[PDB]
Design a protein around this motif. Structure first.
Motif, PDB file in Angstrom:
ATOM      1  N   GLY A  18       0.767  -1.225   0.000  1.00 34.49           N
ATOM      2  CA  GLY A  18       0.000   0.000   0.000  1.00 34.49           C
ATOM      3  C   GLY A  18       0.804   1.285   0.000  1.00 34.49           C
ATOM      4  N   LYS A  19       2.125   1.229  -0.254  1.00 34.32           N
ATOM      5  CA  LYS A  19       2.969   2.428  -0.208  1.00 34.32           C
ATOM      6  C   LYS A  19       2.431   3.536  -1.098  1.00 34.32           C
ATOM      7  N   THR A  20       2.202   3.230  -2.370  1.00 32.61           N
ATOM      8  CA  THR A  20       1.856   4.299  -3.298  1.00 32.61           C
ATOM      9  C   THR A  20       0.449   4.813  -3.036  1.00 32.61           C
ATOM     10  N   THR A  21      -0.468   3.921  -2.644  1.00 37.13           N
ATOM     11  CA  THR A  21      -1.825   4.348  -2.309  1.00 37.13           C
ATOM     12  C   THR A  21      -1.817   5.274  -1.101  1.00 37.13           C
ATOM     13  N   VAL A  22      -1.058   4.916  -0.073  1.00 40.05           N
ATOM     14  CA  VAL A  22      -1.007   5.741   1.132  1.00 40.05           C
ATOM     15  C   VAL A  22      -0.337   7.082   0.833  1.00 40.05           C
ATOM     16  N   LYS A 165      -6.128  -7.951   5.758  1.00 43.88           N
ATOM     17  CA  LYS A 165      -7.260  -8.031   4.860  1.00 43.88           C
ATOM     18  C   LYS A 165      -8.271  -6.997   5.316  1.00 43.88           C
ATOM     19  N   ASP A 166      -8.963  -6.399   4.365  1.00 42.90           N
ATOM     20  CA  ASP A 166      -9.941  -5.390   4.717  1.00 42.90           C
ATOM     21  C   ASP A 166     -11.089  -6.047   5.478  1.00 42.90           C
ATOM     22  N   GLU A 167     -11.536  -5.389   6.538  1.00 42.52           N
ATOM     23  CA  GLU A 167     -12.675  -5.844   7.320  1.00 42.52           C
ATOM     24  C   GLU A 167     -13.622  -4.678   7.517  1.00 42.52           C
ATOM     25  N   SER A 172      -7.236  -1.342   4.707  1.00 39.67           N
ATOM     26  CA  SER A 172      -6.219  -1.046   5.712  1.00 39.67           C
ATOM     27  C   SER A 172      -5.344   0.130   5.285  1.00 39.67           C
ATOM     28  N   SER A 173      -5.189   0.380   3.984  1.00 39.45           N
ATOM     29  CA  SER A 173      -4.482   1.602   3.588  1.00 39.45           C
ATOM     30  C   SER A 173      -5.203   2.864   4.071  1.00 39.45           C
ATOM     31  N   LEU A 174      -6.534   2.853   4.126  1.00 37.65           N
ATOM     32  CA  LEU A 174      -7.236   4.024   4.649  1.00 37.65           C
ATOM     33  C   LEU A 174      -7.070   4.118   6.162  1.00 37.65           C
TER      34      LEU A 174
HETATM   35  N1  LIG Z   1      -7.879  -4.466  -0.740  1.00 35.99           N
HETATM   36  C1  LIG Z   1      -7.012  -3.440  -0.606  1.00 35.99           C
HETATM   37  N2  LIG Z   1      -6.296  -3.086  -1.703  1.00 35.99           N
HETATM   38  C2  LIG Z   1      -5.424  -2.057  -1.610  1.00 35.99           C
HETATM   39  C3  LIG Z   1      -5.254  -1.352  -0.329  1.00 35.99           C
HETATM   40  N3  LIG Z   1      -4.336  -0.396  -0.528  1.00 35.99           N
HETATM   41  C4  LIG Z   1      -3.945  -0.487  -1.827  1.00 35.99           C
HETATM   42  N4  LIG Z   1      -4.590  -1.483  -2.469  1.00 35.99           N
HETATM   43  C5  LIG Z   1      -4.457  -1.916  -3.879  1.00 35.99           C
HETATM   44  O1  LIG Z   1      -3.360  -2.827  -3.980  1.00 35.99           O
HETATM   45  C6  LIG Z   1      -2.643  -2.606  -5.202  1.00 35.99           C
HETATM   46  C7  LIG Z   1      -1.194  -2.221  -4.915  1.00 35.99           C
HETATM   47  O2  LIG Z   1      -1.112  -1.167  -3.944  1.00 35.99           O
HETATM   48  P1  LIG Z   1       0.073  -0.070  -4.015  1.00 35.99           P
HETATM   49  O3  LIG Z   1      -0.310   1.136  -3.181  1.00 35.99           O
HETATM   50  O4  LIG Z   1       0.376   0.162  -5.462  1.00 35.99           O
HETATM   51  O5  LIG Z   1       1.234  -0.920  -3.309  1.00 35.99           O
HETATM   52  P2  LIG Z   1       2.804  -0.570  -3.463  1.00 35.99           P
HETATM   53  O6  LIG Z   1       3.391  -1.604  -4.391  1.00 35.99           O
HETATM   54  O7  LIG Z   1       3.270  -0.708  -2.022  1.00 35.99           O
HETATM   55  O8  LIG Z   1       2.729   0.822  -3.994  1.00 35.99           O
HETATM   56  C8  LIG Z   1      -3.351  -1.471  -5.930  1.00 35.99           C
HETATM   57  O9  LIG Z   1      -4.201  -2.046  -6.940  1.00 35.99           O
HETATM   58  C9  LIG Z   1      -4.154  -0.783  -4.834  1.00 35.99           C
HETATM   59  O10 LIG Z   1      -5.342  -0.151  -5.313  1.00 35.99           O
HETATM   60  C10 LIG Z   1      -6.075  -1.809   0.815  1.00 35.99           C
HETATM   61  O11 LIG Z   1      -5.978  -1.249   1.929  1.00 35.99           O
HETATM   62  N5  LIG Z   1      -6.908  -2.827   0.600  1.00 35.99           N
END
Ligand SMILES: Nc1nc2c(ncn2[C@@H]2O[C@H](COP(=O)(O)OP(=O)(O)O)[C@@H](O)[C@H]2O)c(=O)[nH]1
Ligand SMILES: [Mg+2]
Length: 213
Positions: A18-22, A165-167, A172-174
């Motif tokens: 979740g690095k890039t998403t966060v 895993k999301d619950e 979990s990124s949020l």
């Molecule tokens: N189910 C779920 N998917 C997530 C979450 N955070 C990110 N993702 C998805 O997982 C994939 C990779 O996440 P990303 O942020 O790119 O991970 P990175 O490789 O660490 O940058 C993307 O398709 C995201 O949309 C989360 O909290 N839950």
């Protein structure tokens, strides 16, 4: 003006944590922060991520670098400190206070099995065997953060995230974005005076989640 503080956010993570998403969510909330993504930098680029980090900390404008690399291996954190400490006097005057904040994406008690299960299914959901194989390499090299010895003891502060895993429909990124914000308000009040509103965090995360690069 007199003694400005800069921050470099260093994840310790493997692929798909979740690095890039966060970091995208945070950048969406704080547009002045500089998000530098190693994935966007050529391996034969003149300026690598450490150079781009210092360049993005020169102005009085630029306070935060989101350092977007896995740094799963201890040596990858050592590189950051040594390289940046070593080139800091080239660009920054002696009034600049530089702080490293670790963003630990992998809980201490997580097994490799569950780490694999969560990150692998995130990423699959591009020869399939070679995306698997690269992810395994970052996990094989993973050395958990250890602030009791070099090099991780050079961090000024650690933020411990969850990897679940999301619950209850909560990604979990949020959850992790909220942790980071709550941690910063508490421990670095000058970085974030007051929290974004809850709905703005949600919308900025929604933007990051549904990013299709
Ligand atoms: N189910 C779920 N998917 C997530 C979450 N955070 C990110 N993702 C998805 O997982 C994939 C990779 O996440 P990303 O942020 O790119 O991970 P990175 O490789 O660490 O940058 C993307 O398709 C995201 O949309 C989360 O909290 N839950
Ligand atoms: Mg990424």
């Amino acid at each position: 003006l007199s003694t400005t503080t800069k921050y470099i956010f260093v994840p310790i993570a493997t692929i798909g944590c979740g690095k890039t998403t966060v970091f995208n969510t945070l950048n969406n909330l704080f547009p002045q922060w500089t998000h530098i993504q190693n994935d966007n930098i050529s391996k034969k680029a003149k300026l690598k991520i450490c150079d781009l980090t210092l360049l993005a900390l020169e102005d009085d404008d630029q306070s935060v670098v989101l350092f977007d690399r896995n740094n799963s291996a201890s040596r990858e954190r050592r590189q950051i400190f040594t390289t940046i400490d070593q080139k800091r006097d080239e660009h920054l005057d002696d009034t600049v206070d530089l702080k490293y904040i670790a963003i630990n994406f992998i809980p201490e008690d997580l097994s490799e099995e569950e780490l694999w299960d969560i990150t692998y299914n995130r990423v699959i959901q591009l020869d399939e065997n070679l995306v698997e194989s690269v992810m395994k390499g970052f996990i094989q090299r993973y050395q958990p953060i250890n602030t009791s010895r070099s090099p991780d003891d050079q961090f000024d502060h650690v933020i411990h995230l969850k990897l679940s895993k999301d619950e209850n429909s909560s990604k979990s990124s949020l959850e992790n974005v909220r942790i980071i914000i709550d941690d910063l308000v508490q421990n670095f009040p000058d970085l974030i005076k007051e929290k974004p509103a809850d709905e703005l965090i949600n919308e900025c995360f929604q933007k990051a989640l549904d990013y299709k690069p």
